């Protein structure tokens, strides 16, 4: 994103930091314990080399929370705060 | 001797040092029966000439501790191999007179090594000093206070636990402290009645305690040169009565201020702004929202804790130029009585051009030290404008300085006191990451001042100037349909300029008239224009102009409605 | 011995030093009965050969203080471990003869460490010198004056409070001071009647006092070589009468000036401009506005203070090239009798290309020291032109040099004396931040000279040249419908060139005529063309040209009306 995304730089998707991350991952796996998890809101602009085998190949899509998921999120956010039982949370989650 | 009265500036770190050192020194026997570790070392740092040595001496005198002064270059000037003996003997002597205070003035000379550490003998001196400082067996009550211009100048191992574990930034004295410093430095010269030391104190921005003393001495010397020299009656000792007959006049102080050259004007200022809500005539919704976001967490922290809500620590002001965003930030800081730090756009542009973003880390650390503080990033969109705005660079909105600011903010919130306020006249080009939660998410729009707001702005601008009651201000404010605060200030300044020019020209002519035609009886009619009149304001308004066009206000209205709260929930009702 | 008469240049810092040192030295007993701290150290800095040591010696002689000279390399050339003894003994001896003045010539050798601080023994010397300098127990009246090429060359701890707390920049002598230096250096050579030392002084720009002495000595040696050598009558001691018979002629001085090579031509000049309002024929509205903005705050500061108005400290001249903006700035500086500093475009471009904007800080500090001063940034739009102007760089108008200038201006205004004047031929491309309040907000438009203005410009250009009364100047000025000041200067220069060529060719032929046909009686008819005639001016005007097209004047008119005072308030009346 910093380099662009629609036009960007004249060069390709490769950058210094991602290249170093790829080198470390390629030199990784020896440890058998470190597990790399990557989160990105712009999958289109992510470097394709990141998704090659031996890298973050398992792509997982996180969709918008469902009604039940929304209810759980509201409960988690409001667990600490004193919430009156009168306010129905399922209705609010479904409304959103 | 020297005491708290001598220590001027009222900068409120002397109180912190007192709270630090009384019990270790004022009640030394108490720590013998209680298991607690007192402050083994205190690092006083700040601009030179701020009285750090004076503060240490005053604390030693007021607490009765045996004060020992280890001058930096005094030991450094000694021969290698025997300076170490001097340092060791100094600590032993201070140990003997328990409780004792060992003051190391100019600590950045004994242990200047910042891991560069040039030379050989200086490494020995730093290591031996480290051994001594860490060698305090917690017996007796020797407290080692050191002076340094900046915390990072001394060796980092000196900054570690047990050597110097707590630091106080004395900093430049403020207007209130500058006035108190002037009072302390002007107490035996028999100051004149006309001179008040208040106007000089306000005009004395940028001076330090040493600078204030030098200015006072220069004014005294000007007074001595102006008078008592013409008579030329001098002896071995000037007569006390003859010297007392002179009074330091305001003119002498003014000349001295003109000949001051303060020794660190550039140094950043951490000061409680004097601006008040009165200066801004309105923004009641904005005023209440700012009061909420800033004041409520501190005035009523318990109620924030009860609901388990963490108050936002970032607010971004957006609006047309000249509407009072900087003034609003100063007013909000003043209401909470918290220190205000302002980072204008030139500083950010300098950090960006120089590729030196580590200054952001230093700025945030300074804001953290001066808590409670309101860290204001004025005109934060400057870097985006510098890179473009319509097309800009090929890359995105991310830049080095904003990225460092985001990193510091993400690593912030720990302090619980620093509050970040951002002002930007181009919200469209501001980096979106700035507005994410945990950052300056609370966007506040500052609109053009209303008629009542315009009246208040005119009154604030014209409070100092003599304005005739004939000139109606409400009519002028209402007449200005869309003038910004800057436009109103320009109108007032132009009216004052017209009045000043007319007064100067008139009294100049009137003086010709006496020179050309010497009148037999001298009878001055006073000033031909003693206050600003209706005609001056009419001529000034003739040149009134609207700096802010309606198209840029339209863009701001677009962004405001670009933060639109949806269009389907306005009638949300729970099922009952 | 040496005194104020020997000290030449009339540079007006000797007066400041006198005011500094009389009472501490001229009236030492006075400070015994009065509690005041005198100047413990004074740092005289400037280009080498400016007489700093001479000034110190003259002050010591004229005040009776025992002068002690501690040569930099004299102590530095001594063996390590015993040079410290030399410095300590020098201070003790100066202490014994109280009051005494200790002069440290070439201070940048004893303590050159700028925090780089190479070596080991030199660190000892700097630290011990620091201990001695700070070790002055305020007893006796020893004043330590030091000489250094630049303030930043010496160790910063030497610049701190109590070591060297006040600095004086002797600087290069000016035309008036160059003339006085020539007079002092030409007093025993029996200067000839034809030589006046005024033309040489004007042509002597760039020399220092040492340079002036060297030029005078070279002229004397040329005189000795030209005569008294042909006779070759020499003995053990040349006869006084024989040597007195020679007179240094203007030709010898001219040759010496040709063989001068001044030792610091590049050094920036801080000089009161000799230009006067007479050189500019008009701009009465502009002249009055400039008089207001600059002169009024100082001539009548009380009236500015009465109305609570702070006068603007920045003015931006915009107009077509060659209309006299630089001359106008020089004239305004001359009227206020304030030092003038000019920063031309090449300097800004050099700072921009070299990525060295810290020079702006140095320039502003120099302007601050030479107060009252008019800091003029000539052709400030050069960087914008260098980056483009129609398309330019991808980024905005912000650049490193302008950003540094803005930072210095924002940090300025404290001095109350420096006044920033900006000239730009391309107002459209100038950065808008330059025009914000607190910056060069007062925009002044310099239009093409009028008919009367053109007449005045022609008279000023032709004042030195011999112009025949036959050639009517008003007709020529009126004839030039839109010629700029540069165009008129070019026309005058071309006319002078034509006259010079005609005179040279004619006298050359006339000399052939006397070589080809030796006349029996020599009777020179004088010069065939003694002054500039109508035909020369007609031929020159034949090549007259309008450098400034009407389209660029149209763009300037657009910008001028782009600062339009609205169109609805012209009839503003208060309700009555
Ligand atoms: C047996 C095996 C274990 C392994 O590692 C297991 C492991 N332990 N800790 C961790 S990490 C920790 C767990 C939670 C956070 C991270 N892991 C691990 C490994 C991979 C992915 N996630 C975790 C690798 C590779 C192998 C094998 C597979 C086939 C053959 S053959 C010649 O074809 O017959 C030989 C060897
Ligand atoms: C109680 C609390 C106070 C706080 O800080 C208050 C504070 N003091 N000085 C300042 S600063 C100064 C004031 C004027 C200028 C700046 N602040 C402050 C904090 C935030 C925003 N503005 C000011 C933070 C967070 C909490 C909490 C909230 C919920 C829970 S739980 C587990 O859900 O039950 C636990 C802890
Ligand atoms: C009285 C005053 C003088 C001043 O400075 C005057 C000055 N002297 N040398 C110079 S410089 C030199 C002159 C020729 C070349 C340059 N100046 C000067 C100042 C501004 C612009 N040009 C010159 C500033 C500001 C003030 C004041 C105005 C209002 C108030 S209140 C609280 O509202 O009642 C308090 C203080
Ligand atoms: N607030 C103050 N009250 C009285 N004197 C002050 C004050 N601030 C600075 N000074 C002056 O500063 C002089 C030297 O400064 P100092 O106390 O040594 O600080 P530093 O070591 O940082 O330079 C002192 O002699 C004192 O007169
Ligand atoms: N204004 C002056 N009047 C008389 N002599 C001068 C003057 N300026 C420079 N000189 C000459 O400069 C010579 C040496 O320069 P000096 O005084 O030592 O200055 P610096 O130490 O900076 O080089 C002196 O011998 C003196 O003759």
Curated annotation (Swiss-Prot), chains B, C:
It is found in: Cytoplasm, Cytosol; Endoplasmic reticulum; Nucleus; Cytoplasm, Stress granule. Its EC number is 3.6.4.6. The modification Phosphothreonine is found at residue 237. Phosphorylated by tyrosine kinases in response to T-cell antigen receptor activation. Phosphorylated in mitotic cells. The keyword Protein biosynthesis does not apply. GO terms for biological process: aggresome assembly; ATP metabolic process; autophagosome maturation; autophagy; cellular response to arsenite ion; cellular response to heat; cellular response to misfolded protein; cytoplasm protein quality control. The modification N6-succinyllysine is found at residue 469. It catalyses: ATP + H2O = ADP + phosphate + H(+). Changing residue 117 to A: Does not affect methylation by VCPKMT. One of its GO terms (molecular function) is MHC class I protein binding. The modification N6-acetyllysine is found at residues 303, 306, 469, 555. Homohexamer. Forms a ring-shaped particle of 12.5 nm diameter, that displays 6-fold radial symmetry. Part of a ternary complex containing STX5A, NSFL1C and VCP. NSFL1C forms a homotrimer that binds to one end of a VCP homohexamer. The complex binds to membranes enriched in phosphatidylethanolamine-containing lipids and promotes Golgi membrane fusion. Binds to a heterodimer of NPLOC4 and UFD1, binding to this heterodimer inhibits Golgi-membrane fusion. Interaction with VCIP135 leads to dissociation of the complex via ATP hydrolysis by VCP. This is Transitional endoplasmic reticulum ATPase. It comes from Homo sapiens (Human). The chain holds residues 200 to 775 of 806 of the full protein.
């Amino acid at each position: 994103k910093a380099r662009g995304g629609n036009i960007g730089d004249g060069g390709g998707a490769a950058d210094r930091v991602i290249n170093q991350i790829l080198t470390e991952m390629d030199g990784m796996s020896t440890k058998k314990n470190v597990f790399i998890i990557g989160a990105t809101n712009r999958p289109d602009i992510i470097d394709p080399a990141i998704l090659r085998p031996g890298r973050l190949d398992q792509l997982i899509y996180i969709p918008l929370p469902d009604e039940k998921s929304r209810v759980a999120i509201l409960k988690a956010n409001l667990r600490k705060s004193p919430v009156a039982k009168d306010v129905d949370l399922e209705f609010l989650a479904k409304m959103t | 001797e020297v005491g708290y009265d001598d220590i001027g500036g009222c900068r409120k770190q002397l109180a912190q040092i007192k709270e630090m050192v009384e019990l270790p020194l004022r009640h030394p026997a108490l720590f013998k029966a209680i298991g607690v570790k007192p402050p083994r070392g205190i690092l006083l740092y700040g601009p030179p000439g701020t009285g750090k040595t004076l503060i240490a001496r005053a604390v030693a005198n007021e607490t009765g501790a045996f004060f020992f002064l280890i001058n930096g270059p005094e030991i450094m000037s000694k021969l290698a191999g025997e300076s170490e003996s001097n340092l060791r003997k100094a600590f032993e002597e201070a140990e003997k007179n328990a409780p004792a205070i060992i003051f190391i003035d100019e600590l950045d000379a004994i242990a200047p090594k910042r891991e560069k550490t040039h030379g050989e003998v200086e490494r020995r001196i730093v290591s031996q000093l480290l051994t001594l400082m860490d060698g305090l067996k917690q017996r007796a009550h020797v407290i080692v206070m050191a002076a340094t211009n900046r915390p990072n100048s001394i060796d980092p191992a000196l900054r570690r636990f047990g050597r110097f574990d707590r630091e106080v930034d004395i900093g430049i004295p403020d207007a209130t402290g500058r006035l108190e410093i002037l009072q302390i430095h002007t107490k035996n010269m028999k100051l004149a009645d006309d001179v008040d030391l208040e106007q000089v104190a306000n005009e004395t921005h940028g001076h330090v305690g040493a600078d204030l003393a030098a200015l006072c001495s220069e004014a005294a010397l000007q007074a001595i040169r102006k008078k008592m020299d013409l008579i030329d009656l001098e002896d071995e000792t000037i007569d006390a009565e003859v010297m007392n007959s002179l009074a330091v006049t305001m003119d002498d102080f003014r000349w001295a201020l003109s000949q001051s050259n303060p020794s660190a004007l550039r140094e950043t200022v951490v000061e409680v702004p004097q601006v008040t809500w009165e200066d801004i005539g309105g923004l009641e919704d904005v005023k209440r929202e700012l009061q909420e976001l800033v004041q409520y967490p501190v005035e009523h922290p318990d109620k924030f804790l009860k609901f388990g809500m963490t108050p936002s620590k970032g607010v971004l002001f957006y609006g047309p130029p000249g509407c009072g965003k900087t003034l609003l930030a100063k007013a909000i800081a003043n209401e909470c009585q918290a220190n205000f730090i302002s980072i204008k756009g030139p500083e950010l542009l300098t950090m960006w051009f120089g590729e030196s973003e580590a200054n952001v880390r230093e700025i945030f650390d300074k804001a953290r030290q001066a808590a409670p503080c309101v860290l204001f990033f004025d005109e934060l969109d400057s870097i985006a404008k510098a890179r473009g705005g319509n097309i800009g660079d090929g890359g995105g909105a991310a830049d080095r300085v904003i990225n460092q600011i985001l990193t510091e903010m993400d690593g912030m919130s720990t302090k619980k006191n620093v509050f970040i306020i951002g002002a930007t006249n181009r919200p469209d080009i501001i980096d979106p990451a700035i507005l994410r939660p945990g950052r300056l998410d609370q966007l506040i729009y500052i609109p053009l001042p209303d008629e009542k707001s315009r009246v208040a702005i005119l009154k604030a601008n014209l409070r100092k100037s003599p304005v005739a009651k004939d000139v109606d201000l409400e009519f002028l404010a209402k007449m200005t349909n869309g003038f910004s605060g800057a436009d109103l200030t320009e109108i007032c300044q132009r009216a004052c300029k017209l009045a000043i020019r007319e007064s100067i020209e008139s009294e100049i002519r009137r003086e010709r008239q006496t020179q050309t035609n010497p009148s037999a009886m001298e009878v001055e009619e006073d000033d031909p224009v003693p206050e600003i009149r209706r005609d001056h304001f009419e001529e000034a308004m003739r040149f009134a102009r609207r700096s802010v066009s309606d198209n840029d206000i339209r863009k701001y209205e677009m962004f405001a409605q670009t933060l639109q709260q949806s269009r389907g929930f306005g009638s949300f009702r729970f099922p009952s």
